[PDB]
C-alpha cells in the first residue's frame, strides 16, 4: 500500500525527446483510424467499430461519446484510456463550468480541460501518459462550430478536417483534396464515409461504422417541452439505418 | 544469484532468503560476547564489554527494563536503545493500565513483532542487534534469546556475540548443574562467569571488563559494574 513512485516517469532524454510521449504517439498510430470534418452548418466525427469476434456486441461499445449536449469526442489508440478520459471530461465540464456559470462550456475550453488532464499524466509521479489522441467536435453560441485534436502531450490544435490512427497519412491527403470552406453538412458526412472506406479491411456497413454529427438543435431529443428558449442537443449519433441509407447512394 | 537480491529487505532471493536480514544477523557475530543462564529462583546476565582504546570506556551492554526484567546486547548499540526503550514502554503500559507486571514471554512476542515489521517495510532496515532477556514473573525465572530476524526462543542458558559457541558448548554440558542452583545467587553468577570464559582467546576478564546483572524471587533487577564484580574474578 501507499504510492512509492513519487517521480516523473516521463523525463527528457539527452536529445530533448520525452520518451513516454513519443511511445504513446506510437500507440496512437496502431489505433484504428478516426476522423473529423468541419462543415458550415455542422461537424462530423467518425471511426470504425473494429469488432473482436462476431460474438461481441458492437453497439455496446461507445467509440463516439457525448461530452455535453453540444460536444462529442472520438479517439485513436487505447480504448480503456479514452473511456476514463470521457468520464473525467464529462465531470469537469460540470465541476469547472456548469456549476459555476449555469451553462455548458464552449468547445475550446472543455478541450483546454482535457488537455490539462493529459498533460498532468505527462508530469505527475508514478504515472504514464494516456495512449490516445482525441478528436473533439462542438458548437457554442460565440465561436460557432469547431474541431480540435488533443494528443498524449496535452497539445491541442484546431482543424478544418483531419484523421488520426493507422491510416492517418493516407486520409489527411484524401481530405485535403476534398475540403472546401462551403460544404453543407450532408456533403461532409459523404466525404467522411469515403475517407473511411480506405482505412477498413472487412465489412463496411452501419454496424461497423460509428458516426456522429454536431448539427442543428434536436427538439425531440430534449425530453420535455415548454421552455422555448432551448431547442436541445446539437450532438447526434447516427443510427445503423441512417449510415446504410447514405452508403447505397455512395 | 547474490546479485540484485540484496538491494533492500523487501526482496526475496531465488533461494528464498532475505539477505539484508542475514547481513543484520552478521552484525551480531561481530559483536562482543554476552551470556545468560537461569535456575528456578534467579536469572543472570554476564556481558564482557569491549573497549575502543586503552583510554576508553567499556561500553555498557546491560539495560534495565522494569523491576523484574532486563536485557544484554550484542551488535549495533543504538538499536538496543530503540528496542529496550520500546520494552520499557510496554512494561510501563502493562503496569499502568492493568496493574500487571508484564510477562517475559509477552515481552518476547512484542520484540518479535517489532523486528518483523522492519523485515517487510520498504525504506526501513532490520535491527542490527541480538538481545538476551532475563526476567522474573508469575511463572518464575526466564531467559530469552532475541534475533533481529524476529526469532525469539526461551532457553535455560545461551550466549551471543564473538566466539559465543564456546560458552554455549560449556552451558550445554553444565546444564544439570546450574539449573539446580536455587536460592543461591553467588554460585549462579559464578557459573555465568565461568561460562563466559570459554569464549576468550582475548585475555583474563578484569574489573572494568566485566558486567553482571541479576533478577530473582526476592531480588529486583540490578546491574553490577567494577567494584561490586571484583569478588567474581
Amino acid at each position: 500500500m501507499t504510492d512509492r513512485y513519487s517521480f516523473s516517469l516521463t523525463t527528457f532524454s539527452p536529445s530533448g525527446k520525452l520518451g513516454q510521449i513519443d511511445y504513446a504517439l506510437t500507440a496512437v498510430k496502431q489505433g484504428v483510424t478516426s476522423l473529423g470534418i468541419k462543415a458550415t452548418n455542422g461537424v462530423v466525427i467518425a471511426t470504425e467499430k473494429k469488432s473482436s469476434s462476431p460474438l461481441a456486441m458492437s453497439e455496446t461499445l461507445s467509440k463516439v461519446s457525448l461530452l455535453t449536449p453540444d460536444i462529442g469526442a472520438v479517439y485513436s489508440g487505447m480504448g480503456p484510456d479514452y473511456r476514463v478520459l470521457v468520464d473525467k471530461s464529462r465531470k469537469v465540464a460540470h465541476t469547472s463550468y456548469k456549476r459555476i456559470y449555469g451553462e455548458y462550456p464552449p468547445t475550446k475550453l472543455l478541450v483546454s480541460e482535457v488537455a490539462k488532464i493529459m498533460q498532468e499524466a505527462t508530469q505527475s509521479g508514478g504515472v504514464r501518459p494516456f495512449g490516445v489522441s482525441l478528436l473533439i467536435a462542438g458548437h457554442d453560441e460565440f465561436n460557432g462550430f469547431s474541431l480540435y485534436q488533443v494528443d498524449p502531450s496535452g497539445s491541442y490544435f484546431p482543424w478544418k478536417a483531419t484523421a488520426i490512427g493507422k491510416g492517418s497519412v493516407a486520409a489527411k491527403t484524401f481530405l485535403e483534396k476534398r475540403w472546401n470552406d462551403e460544404l453543407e453538412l450532408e456533403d461532409a458526412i459523404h466525404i467522411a464515409l469515403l475517407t473511411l472506406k480506405e482505412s477498413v479491411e472487412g465489412e463496411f456497413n452501419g454496424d461497423t461504422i460509428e458516426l456522429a454529427i454536431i448539427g442543428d438543435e434536436n427538439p425531440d431529443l430534449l425530453g420535455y417541452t415548454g421552455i422555448p428558449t432551448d431547442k436541445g442537443p446539437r450532438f447526434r449519433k447516427l443510427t445503423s439505418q441512417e449510415i446504410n441509407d447514405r452508403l447505397e447512394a455512395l | 544469484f547474490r546479485n540484485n537480491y540484496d538491494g533492500d529487505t523487501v526482496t526475496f532471493s531465488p533461494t528464498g532468503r532475505l539477505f539484508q536480514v542475514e547481513y543484520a544477523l552478521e552484525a551480531i557475530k561481530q559483536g562482543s560476547v554476552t551470556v545468560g543462564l537461569r535456575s528456578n529462583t534467579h536469572a543472570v546476565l554476564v556481558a564482557l564489554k569491549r573497549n575502543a582504546d586503552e583510554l576508553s570506556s567499556y561500553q555498557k551492554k546491560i539495560i534495565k527494563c522494569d523491576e523484574h526484567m532486563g536485557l544484554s546486547l550484542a551488535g549495533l548499540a543504538p538499536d538496543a536503545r530503540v528496542l529496550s526503550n520500546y520494552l520499557r514502554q510496554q512494561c510501563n503500559y502493562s503496569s499502568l493500565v492493568f496493574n500487571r507486571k508484564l510477562a517475559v514471554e509477552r515481552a518476547g512476542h512484542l520484540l518479535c513483532d517489532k523486528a518483523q515489521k522492519n523485515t517487510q517495510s520498504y525504506g526501513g532496515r532490520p535491527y542490527g542487534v541480538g538481545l538476551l532477556i532475563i526476567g522474573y514473573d508469575k511463572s518464575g525465572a526466564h531467559l530469552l534469546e532475541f534475533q533481529p530476524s524476529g526469532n525469539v526462543t526461551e532457553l535455560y542458558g545461551t550466549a551471543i556475540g564473538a566466539r559465543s559457541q564456546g560458552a554455549k558448548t560449556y552451558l550445554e554440558r553444565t546444564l544439570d548443574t546450574f539449573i539446580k542452583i536455587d536460592g543461591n545467587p553467588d554460585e549462579l553468577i559464578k557459573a555465568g562467569v565461568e561460562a563466559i570464559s570459554q569464549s576468550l582467546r582475548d585475555e583474563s576478564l578484569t574489573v572494568d571488563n566485566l558486567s553482571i546483572a541479576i533478577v530473582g524471587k526476592d531480588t529486583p533487577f540490578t546491574i553490577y559494574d567494577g567494584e561490586a564484580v571484583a569478588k567474581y574474578i
Binding site: - | 540484496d6 538491494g7 533492500d8 539477505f19 539484508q20 547481513y23 543484520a24 544477523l25 552478521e26 552484525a27 551480531i28 557475530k29 561481530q30 575502543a52 582504546d53 586503552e54 583510554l55 576508553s56 570506556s57 561500553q59 551488535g75 549495533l76 548499540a77 543504538p78 536503545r81 530503540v82 525504506g123 526501513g124 532496515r125 532490520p126 542490527g128
Partner: protein
C-alpha cells in the same frame, strides 16, 4: 550504490561507515579529562591567510558546565549544537538542575539516529562536569554510538595523536600539564606551525565552567611549551 540504511555483507551500515571517512578528513580535535578539569583543543586550519582566524568556531559552549569540540563537516554540527543547547536548557526548565553530561550526550546521539536523509559528517567531543560523575569526556559518532574517554583525538591527525595520548596520559595530570599536552600533540600533527591563530584551547572547571581561552592566554602556553621542551 543501493540505499541509505542498507547493510553490508559484513553487517555494517554503508552510509555510517562512509561518514566516518569524512571525519578522518576533518581538522584535528583533542580532549583530555583530568581531576582538575577537562581540556579541549582544536586545529583551526584556515584554507587561506585572508581568512580571519578567530571566526573559526570549532569549540562551542553547550551549557555553563558542558562544552564541545567538533571535527568533520562542521556545518552539520549546527543543528546538533542547537539541539544540545535546547536539551540542556529544557532539562533545567523541567528539573531545576544541571543536566548530566552522559544524558546530554545520549540526547545528541538520539538525534544522530534520525536518518533526515543522511548521517552527520561530523563527530563531537563533549566535555563537562556534573556532581555525580565529575569531569567527563565523550566521543559522539554519527552512528549514534558514544564512548567515554580519559583522552581522545578525532580528525586527520588522530592516529598519531591517540598513540601520543596513550603514552602521556595518567590518572594524576594537573590541568596545566593537560593544557601543555594538548598543545604539544597538536603541534606534532598539524600540517602547519602551531601559533595562537591556528589553534584554540578551552576547558571546563567545576568552579568557573566552560571557558574558551583567548589568543593571549594561549600564546603564553605555546611560549611555555617551547621552553619546557628546550631544557628537555
Amino acid at each position: 550504490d543501493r540505499g541509505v540504511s542498507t547493510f553490508s555483507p559484513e553487517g555494517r551500515l554503508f552510509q555510517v561507515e562512509y561518514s566516518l571517512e569524512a571525519i578522518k578528513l576533518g581538522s584535528t580535535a583533542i580532549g583530555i579529562a583530568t581531576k582538575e578539569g577537562v581540556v579541549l583543543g582544536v586545529e583551526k586550519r584556515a584554507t587561506s591567510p585572508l581568512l580571519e582566524s578567530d571566526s573559526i568556531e570549532k569549540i562551542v559552549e553547550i551549557d555553563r558546565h558542558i562544552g564541545c569540540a567538533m571535527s568533520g563537516l562542521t556545518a552539520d554540527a549546527r543543528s546538533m549544537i542547537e539541539h544540545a543547547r535546547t536539551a540542556a536548557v529544557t532539562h533545567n526548565l523541567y528539573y531545576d538542575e544541571d543536566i548530566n553530561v552522559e544524558s546530554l550526550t545520549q540526547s545528541v546521539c538520539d538525534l544522530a539516529l534520525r536518518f533526515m536523509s543522511r548521517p552527520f559528517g561530523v563527530a563531537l567531543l563533549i566535555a563537562g562536569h556534573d556532581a555525580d560523575d565529575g569531569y567527563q569526556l565523550f566521543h559522539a559518532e554519527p552512528s549514534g554510538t558514544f564512548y567515554r574517554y580519559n583522552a581522545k583525538a578525532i580528525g586527520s591527525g588522530s592516529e598519531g595523536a591517540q598513540a601520543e595520548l596513550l603514552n602521556e596520559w595518567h590518572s594524576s595530570l594537573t590541568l596545566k600539564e593537560a593544557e601543555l599536552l594538548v598543545l604539544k600533540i597538536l603541534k606534532q600533527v598539524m600540517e602547519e606551525k602551531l601559533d595562537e591563530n591556528n589553534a584554540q584551547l578551552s576547558c571546563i572547571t567545576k568552579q568557573d565552567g566552560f571557558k574558551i581561552y583567548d589568543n593571549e592566554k594561549t600564546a603564553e602556553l605555546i611560549k611555555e611549551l617551547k621552553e619546557k621542551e628546550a631544557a628537555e
